[PDB]
Amino acid sequence: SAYDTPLGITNPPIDELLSRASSKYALVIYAAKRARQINDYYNEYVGPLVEPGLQEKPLSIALREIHGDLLEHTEG
């Protein structure tokens, strides 16, 4: 199961994210709320956890983080 390397938005790969959260629909909010938090930190102020890029976006950071298993979620 080799893809050489991902690039841009397709990094990180979705199948490795779907393992982490219950479903893509959860993963969306999972990433989104975290991203809204990361957005807020620059201005709930926790993060960024993983060492971010120089000019990197909160969505990329959030979607990177979920893949790393630095976060945990509760389904309402």
Binding site: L7, G8, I9, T10
Partner: protein
């Protein structure tokens, strides 16, 4: 004369026409060409469109930078 109920009834009704399909901001339209250099997830955007389409986002980073 267009009545009060005539606002709601018809194909030009409030319920039908002016609730199901609207105009949207932060949105463009253009003619499509092929981009076989691009990866599946990538799409090519005309720079003169893009500039206006992301104007506030690029303004934000342009104020973030000096």
């Amino acid at each position: 004369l267009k009545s009060l109920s005539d606002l709601l009834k018809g194909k030009q009704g409030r319920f039908r026409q002016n609730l199901l399909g609207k105009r949207v901001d932060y949105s463009g339209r253009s003619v499509i060409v092929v981009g076989p250099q691009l990866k599946l997830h990538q799409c090519g955007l005309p720079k003169l469109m893009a500039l206006e389409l992301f104007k506030p986002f690029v303004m934000k980073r342009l104020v973030d930078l000096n």
